[PDB]
Design an enzyme around this catalytic site. Sequence first.
Site, PDB file in Angstrom:
ATOM      1  N   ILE A  13       4.340  -1.869 -11.136  1.00  0.00           N
ATOM      2  CA  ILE A  13       3.437  -2.422 -10.125  1.00  0.00           C
ATOM      3  C   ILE A  13       2.495  -1.364  -9.552  1.00  0.00           C
ATOM      4  O   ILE A  13       1.642  -1.673  -8.722  1.00  0.00           O
ATOM      5  CB  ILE A  13       4.229  -3.083  -8.967  1.00  0.00           C
ATOM      6  CG1 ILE A  13       5.228  -2.087  -8.358  1.00  0.00           C
ATOM      7  CG2 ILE A  13       4.913  -4.349  -9.477  1.00  0.00           C
ATOM      8  CD1 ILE A  13       6.064  -2.632  -7.198  1.00  0.00           C
ATOM      9  N   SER A  15       0.680   2.895 -10.521  1.00  0.00           N
ATOM     10  CA  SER A  15       0.598   4.135 -11.288  1.00  0.00           C
ATOM     11  C   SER A  15      -0.502   5.041 -10.744  1.00  0.00           C
ATOM     12  O   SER A  15      -1.424   4.579 -10.072  1.00  0.00           O
ATOM     13  CB  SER A  15       0.344   3.838 -12.766  1.00  0.00           C
ATOM     14  OG  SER A  15      -0.839   3.080 -12.933  1.00  0.00           O
ATOM     15  N   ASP A 134      -1.961   8.316   7.384  1.00  0.00           N
ATOM     16  CA  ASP A 134      -2.614   7.818   6.182  1.00  0.00           C
ATOM     17  C   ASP A 134      -2.660   6.295   6.184  1.00  0.00           C
ATOM     18  O   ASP A 134      -2.371   5.647   5.174  1.00  0.00           O
ATOM     19  CB  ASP A 134      -1.899   8.339   4.935  1.00  0.00           C
ATOM     20  CG  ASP A 134      -2.747   8.220   3.679  1.00  0.00           C
ATOM     21  OD1 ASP A 134      -3.993   8.217   3.786  1.00  0.00           O
ATOM     22  OD2 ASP A 134      -2.161   8.136   2.579  1.00  0.00           O
ATOM     23  N   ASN A 139      -1.839   1.132   1.877  1.00  0.00           N
ATOM     24  CA  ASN A 139      -0.541   1.537   2.414  1.00  0.00           C
ATOM     25  C   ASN A 139       0.041   0.524   3.395  1.00  0.00           C
ATOM     26  O   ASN A 139       1.060   0.783   4.041  1.00  0.00           O
ATOM     27  CB  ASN A 139      -0.657   2.899   3.101  1.00  0.00           C
ATOM     28  CG  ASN A 139      -0.863   4.033   2.118  1.00  0.00           C
ATOM     29  OD1 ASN A 139      -0.511   3.931   0.943  1.00  0.00           O
ATOM     30  ND2 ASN A 139      -1.439   5.124   2.603  1.00  0.00           N
TER      31      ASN A 139
HETATM   32  C1  LIG Z   1       7.906   2.887  -3.501  1.00  0.00           C
HETATM   33  C2  LIG Z   1       6.587   3.195  -3.514  1.00  0.00           C
HETATM   34  C3  LIG Z   1       5.682   2.755  -2.370  1.00  0.00           C
HETATM   35  N1  LIG Z   1       5.705   1.328  -2.388  1.00  0.00           N
HETATM   36  C4  LIG Z   1       6.586   0.537  -1.623  1.00  0.00           C
HETATM   37  O1  LIG Z   1       7.410   0.964  -0.827  1.00  0.00           O
HETATM   38  C5  LIG Z   1       6.316  -0.884  -1.952  1.00  0.00           C
HETATM   39  C6  LIG Z   1       6.857  -2.145  -1.510  1.00  0.00           C
HETATM   40  N2  LIG Z   1       6.359  -3.285  -2.033  1.00  0.00           N
HETATM   41  C7  LIG Z   1       5.409  -3.284  -2.929  1.00  0.00           C
HETATM   42  N3  LIG Z   1       4.963  -4.571  -3.406  1.00  0.00           N
HETATM   43  C8  LIG Z   1       3.974  -4.776  -4.455  1.00  0.00           C
HETATM   44  C9  LIG Z   1       3.018  -3.829  -4.810  1.00  0.00           C
HETATM   45  C10 LIG Z   1       2.080  -4.113  -5.824  1.00  0.00           C
HETATM   46  C11 LIG Z   1       2.097  -5.349  -6.477  1.00  0.00           C
HETATM   47  N4  LIG Z   1       1.108  -5.634  -7.515  1.00  0.00           N
HETATM   48  C12 LIG Z   1      -0.209  -5.807  -7.156  1.00  0.00           C
HETATM   49  C13 LIG Z   1      -1.157  -5.417  -8.273  1.00  0.00           C
HETATM   50  N5  LIG Z   1      -0.862  -6.045  -9.480  1.00  0.00           N
HETATM   51  C14 LIG Z   1      -1.355  -7.190  -9.568  1.00  0.00           C
HETATM   52  C15 LIG Z   1       0.498  -6.016  -9.802  1.00  0.00           C
HETATM   53  C16 LIG Z   1       1.407  -6.366  -8.639  1.00  0.00           C
HETATM   54  C17 LIG Z   1       3.048  -6.303  -6.104  1.00  0.00           C
HETATM   55  F1  LIG Z   1       3.096  -7.500  -6.695  1.00  0.00           F
HETATM   56  C18 LIG Z   1       3.980  -6.014  -5.100  1.00  0.00           C
HETATM   57  N6  LIG Z   1       4.874  -2.148  -3.361  1.00  0.00           N
HETATM   58  C19 LIG Z   1       5.316  -0.930  -2.886  1.00  0.00           C
HETATM   59  N7  LIG Z   1       4.921   0.448  -3.197  1.00  0.00           N
HETATM   60  C20 LIG Z   1       3.865   0.804  -4.105  1.00  0.00           C
HETATM   61  C21 LIG Z   1       3.530   0.017  -5.202  1.00  0.00           C
HETATM   62  C22 LIG Z   1       2.439   0.458  -6.007  1.00  0.00           C
HETATM   63  C23 LIG Z   1       1.752   1.644  -5.624  1.00  0.00           C
HETATM   64  C24 LIG Z   1       2.163   2.342  -4.488  1.00  0.00           C
HETATM   65  C25 LIG Z   1       1.499   3.633  -3.984  1.00  0.00           C
HETATM   66  C26 LIG Z   1       0.167   3.885  -4.677  1.00  0.00           C
HETATM   67  C27 LIG Z   1       2.469   4.782  -4.238  1.00  0.00           C
HETATM   68  O2  LIG Z   1       1.274   3.511  -2.603  1.00  0.00           O
HETATM   69  N8  LIG Z   1       3.180   1.885  -3.778  1.00  0.00           N
END
Ligand SMILES: C=CCn1c(=O)c2cnc(Nc3ccc(N4CCN(C)CC4)c(F)c3)nc2n1-c1cccc(C(C)(C)O)n1
Length: 261
Positions: A13, A15, A134, A139
């Site tokens: 999800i 990179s 940040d 975020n």
């Molecule tokens: C553990 C790492 C930090 N982090 C969370 O605590 C954290 C908690 N929840 C989610 N939920 C979530 C994030 C992204 C999609 N996607 C949307 C784009 N695409 C369509 C694919 C799905 C989705 F569906 C759900 N994400 C989280 N994190 C996350 C994810 C990606 C990048 C980053 C960075 C760049 C490090 O900030 N963080």
Amino acid sequence: SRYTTEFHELEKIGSGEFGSVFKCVKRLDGCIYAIKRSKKPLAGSVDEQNALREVYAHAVLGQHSHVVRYFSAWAEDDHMLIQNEYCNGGSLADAISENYRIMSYFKEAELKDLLLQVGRGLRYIHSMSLVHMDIKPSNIFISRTKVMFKIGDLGHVTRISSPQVEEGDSRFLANEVLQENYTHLPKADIFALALTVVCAAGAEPLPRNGDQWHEIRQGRLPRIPQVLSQEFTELLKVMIHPDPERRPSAMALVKHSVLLS
Ligand SMILES: C=CCn1c(=O)c2cnc(Nc3ccc(N4CCN(C)CC4)c(F)c3)nc2n1-c1cccc(C(C)(C)O)n1
Ligand SMILES: [Cl-]
């Protein structure tokens, strides 16, 4: 490997230069988590310092409903892994992008709900004598329940008392921080939150630098295409006031009449 052992990968999800983030199910409890996997940074480096801020921020913070919950962190096979709450709504940045794609928007009411909820997260963090440093759409994470906004990515969190400042995204950075003035760091989070809400409101991509960058720090808002009350506007304006002492605290923010509720 503990990662493979305790968890099953479902989907990548995220990179970047931080490594990768995976949506994972934990075998034992059947719950979903966002696990960040990254090359263990060079000892004594920037990303190590950034990485330790994250761990030691949880050590203090514990658990709050508008902060992305942290469950565990470990290292193995020359990588470090951090297991966090999975927010099924992605980040506010994803949502903003999706709004433009299909041409929807956040109602003025929903902008106010966003401001209050993240504001609650900030008040909690600030009460623990910490600052996030940040705040920006990417975020802020979303859980759909009917929606919860949660502050994530604690890699820039530092103490109010003895602050060690890694500067955040230049687009959301208050001038006084750029001026190495760290006497009111909580007010920098407030500044960044205002611009975050303005992004959600449909405003154009914020400047990284140059004239328009400075014009914002002079205390004037980017143009918002929706029809916002003159008073909600005035709340956002004073949140980017040049004098950070004129910006409301998080606690003053969540108690504001404009945002209740
Ligand atoms: C553990 C790492 C930090 N982090 C969370 O605590 C954290 C908690 N929840 C989610 N939920 C979530 C994030 C992204 C999609 N996607 C949307 C784009 N695409 C369509 C694919 C799905 C989705 F569906 C759900 N994400 C989280 N994190 C996350 C994810 C990606 C990048 C980053 C960075 C760049 C490090 O900030 N963080
Ligand atoms: Cl302060």
